[model samples]
Target: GSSGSSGTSKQRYSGKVHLCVARYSYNPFDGPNENPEAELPLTAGKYLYVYGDMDEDGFYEGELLDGQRGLVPSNFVDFVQDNESRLASTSGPSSG
Candidate 1:
């Protein structure tokens, strides 16, 4: 069922990103997904493996500088596409 995070809209994590601020964390709920429950803090000069957007929301699901998976606000980070970076997931965006 995995399709490299394809087959779904909004799950555009293929792009890479890095913190533009000193420190930050963004998640509004707790669950099996978007686990902000422990969304680690991202440093201001590190890159993140953008997994995908939170189904088209304010935050994006990605891995922190230290390889910690979590969510982050758009205002705090930006893409490191450098022209050709992208997110790769085990599955496409969810329908639920």
Candidate 2:
């Protein structure tokens, strides 16, 4: 879920959100996920997250931003309750 700010839960974008990678020319499998090694600029009002199909499974795996493409595991993705609304049937409960 999103972290509450001033006793209010701020909305965190979730579920297939679009993000522009620092460089689009580099392939994900080339040289140990190089994007993580590059310096990424963050948008003031935007939060960035990295995603990839690490296992070549054709699925976008979740990840967190860490410098360039050094992402923590998908489990580390921010838990935004707002996104839960999209998966209410699967996630259980309708907090939205």
Candidate 3:
């Protein structure tokens, strides 16, 4: 049986939380996992929510802009934490 909520320790998040743009498409099967089903499908130019630190396997927990969550390669993405540098429609190759 599960115990009720405990008042002992408060929950906190020290993880890295930020938005990142995919540099290229990444398929889960091409990643560093035998069971790649839980990995996120990455699409270039898509912004994702990264909510955890990088792992020793060189992956980070990423959540799709919609509602999917899974592991993604940290090296395959570019950070966009600061909104200062916006990509122009004509400049970015994936602009639609």
Compared with the true structure, what per-residue lDDT tens digits does model 2 show for residues 50-95? 4322323322232325434333232223323334355337444567
In model 1, the clashing pairs are 13-87, 14-86, 14-87, 15-86, 15-87
TM-score per candidate, in order? 0.45, 0.23, 0.60
Question: What residue runs in model 3 are displaced by over 4 Å at the alpha carbon?
Answer: 1-16, 29-34, 85-96
TM-score top scorer: 3
Candidate 1 vs. true structure, TM-score: 0.45
Candidate 2 collision pairs: 1-79, 35-69, 36-68, 36-69, 36-70
User: Candidate 3: worst 10 consecutive residues by lDDT?
Assistant: 6-15
Candidate lDDT values, in order: 0.53, 0.34, 0.69
Tens digits of per-residue lDDT for model 3, 1-96: 224454532212234465788889888877677878667878898878766456556676678888677777877888866656665546544658
Q: Rank the candidates by lDDT, best first.
A: 3, 1, 2
Candidate 1 residue-wise lDDT, 1-96, digit = tens? 234544545435554333333234433454455654544455555566656455345565657656766666656665654644365646666788
Clashes of each: 5, 5, 0
lDDT (Cα, 0-100) at 41 in candidate 1: 58
